[PDB]
Amino acid sequence: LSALNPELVQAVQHVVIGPSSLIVHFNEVIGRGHFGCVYHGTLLDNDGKKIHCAVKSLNRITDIGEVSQFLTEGIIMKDFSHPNVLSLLGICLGSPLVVLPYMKHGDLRNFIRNETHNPTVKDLIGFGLQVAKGMKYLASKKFVHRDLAARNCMLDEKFTVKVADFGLARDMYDKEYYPVKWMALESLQTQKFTTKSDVWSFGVLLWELMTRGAPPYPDVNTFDITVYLLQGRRLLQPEYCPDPLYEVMLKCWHPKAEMRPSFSELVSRISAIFSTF
Numbered sequence: 001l002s003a004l005n006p007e008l009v010q011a012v013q014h015v016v017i018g019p020s021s022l023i024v025h026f027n028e029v030i031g032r033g034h035f036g037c038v039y040h041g042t043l044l045d046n047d048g049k050k051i052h053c054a055v056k057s058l059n060r061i062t063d064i065g066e067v068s069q070f071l072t073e074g075i076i077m078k079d080f081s082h083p084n085v086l087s088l089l090g091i092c093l094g095s096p097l098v099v100l101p102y103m104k105h106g107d108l109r110n111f112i113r114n115e116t117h118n119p120t121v122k123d124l125i126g127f128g129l130q131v132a133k134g135m136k137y138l139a140s141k142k143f144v145h146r147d148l149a150a151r152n153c154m155l156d157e158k159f160t161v162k163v164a165d166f167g168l169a170r171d172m173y174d175k176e177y178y179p180v181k182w183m184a185l186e187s188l189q190t191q192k193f194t195t196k197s198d199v200w201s202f203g204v205l206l207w208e209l210m211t212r213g214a215p216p217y218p219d220v221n222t223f224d225i226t227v228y229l230l231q232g233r234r235l236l237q238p239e240y241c242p243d244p245l246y247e248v249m250l251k252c253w254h255p256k257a258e259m260r261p262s263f264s265e266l267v268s269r270i271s272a273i274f275s276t277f
């Protein structure tokens with residue numbers, strides 16, 4: 001710990017949680033191991049109010065070199081706050097900890113897939129507008145997500161969607177042992193990601209929401225996807241999906257990235273479609 005550069009130690013203090021401020025229960029995991037070593041935690045604020053949080057131990061980090069990068073990951077992600085983006089409550093420096101807020105309803109794809117829950121067409125579009133909002137915030141900060149899908153969005157107690165799976169919340173699904181179908185055609189052809197490829201992915205997420213979490217292109221192999229899209233074939237209009245919203249999904253999948261809507265135009269368009277219910 002004393003090996004760390006003191007200027008960097010100083011720069012990361014506003015992201016660091018003191019040990020006396022956090023209670024981690026290592027005896028109870030969140031989400032039956034499906035998110036790796038994520039535990040129920042209790043974070044205390046300056047007023048001593050208790051915040052129920054999700055604590056992830058970062059086992060991969062073992063040396064002062066990898067520790068330094070992680071401090072910078074915490075510093076950058078701490079400045080990303082928006083109601084539709086999953087926040088970084090803090091970091092704890094026993095492997096380093098990543099303290100995230102608790103999401104009662106877990107991931108979005110699993111929530112919409114669970115037969116017990118019956119969201120309406122309005123609730124679904126409302127989840128899509130929420131994602132679009134978080135994505136609009138990320139695009140304003142020049143942040144490229146690179147892996148947007150319903151499995152990577154979380155749901156809290158007030159059914160507020162949070163864009164996750166980025167920064168210190170990356171590798172969300174690393175269950176240790178004893179995404180071409182969301183990718184833009186140019187991402188598949190050149191391995192380069194932009195806001196314009198995030199929009200293609202958002203279009204897929206919109207289709208996932210309206211099908212209640214059906215897998216895209218079930219009969220197309222991941223190697224065959226490139227040829228399929230080059231022929232100008234796309235995901236079909238889901239059953240209870242309105243024509244204006246399907247027109248939006250198709251605009252998201254245009255072969256020319258520059259012809260695709262921005263997240264601002266998608267927020268604008270989707271909110272006005274949402275308002276018609």
Ligand SMILES: Fc1ccc(Cc2c[nH]c3ncc(-c4cnn(C5CCNCC5)c4)cc23)cc1
Pocket residue numbers: 030031035038054056098100101102103104105106107164165168169170171172
């Ligand atoms: F580095 C990362 C570390 C952790 C994450 C995930 C994560 C963060 N906060 C969370 N809060 C709650 C849940 C969660 C999972 N399952 N559940 C319910 C579902 C409904 N049934 C009961 C169980 C709630 C997951 C998370 C991402 C990145």
